[PDB]
Amino acid sequence: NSQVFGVARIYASFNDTFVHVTDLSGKETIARVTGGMKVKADRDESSPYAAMLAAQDVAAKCKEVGITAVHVKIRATGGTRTKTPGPGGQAALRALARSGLRIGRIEDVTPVPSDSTRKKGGRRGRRL
């Protein structure tokens, strides 16, 4: 169990996908990338394949710096928002497990309130 553990923070929205990495300390972050970085379309920003490559290059830098194992922590945006993760979450996550960094200790720390402040839509909402 000598492999050093970092932590991979997966924020999976539908506007993009964040694969952030730190050590077990949130301070001194290691790796950080998106599909908003890995393609220029502005529509598929959060999409799986882009977040797939996001995780690919994350693991690349994890090796280049010498990080070998990870505890993973996923979240949607949260607060009072959709509260559902984006597909980039699974895509980058599976691709992490595939790229072969050791994986573990899964959880959803997506922030959840005690009935907190109001929302966008004004009682009647983003009607389409």
């Binding site: 194992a69 996923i74 699974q90 839509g121 983003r126």
Partner: protein, 97 residues
């Protein structure tokens, strides 16, 4: 004319409840109203489970799961085909599928 003894859903004794925000359309609507659906799923979906089981320290460790209590808006649901229209008696019934 009247279409539901509910008049939509069951307040039927108090006069008031509190509202919520629909997860998609955001619409403030009362809580005894406010279509509800639990949703239990995994994070490790049926093939990534296998990938993780190989890539995993802590053998067998666990399958945590995502638990979400979706408060739906009416027409939002209707277009989501959470439900569809039903005939008179299919409306009368209150049983799940």
């Amino acid at each position: 004319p009247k279409k539901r003894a509910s008049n939509g859903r069951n307040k039927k004794g108090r006069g008031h409840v509190k509202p919520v925000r629909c997860v998609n359309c955001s619409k403030s609507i009362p809580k005894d109203k406010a279509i509800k659906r639990m949703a239990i799923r995994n994070i490790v979906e049926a093939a990534a489970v296998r990938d993780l089981s190989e890539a995993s320290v802590y053998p067998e460790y666990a399958l945590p799961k995502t638990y979400n209590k979706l408060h739906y808006c009416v027409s939002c649901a209707i277009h989501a085909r959470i439900v569809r229209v039903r005939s008179r008696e299919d409306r009368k019934n209150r049983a799940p599928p």
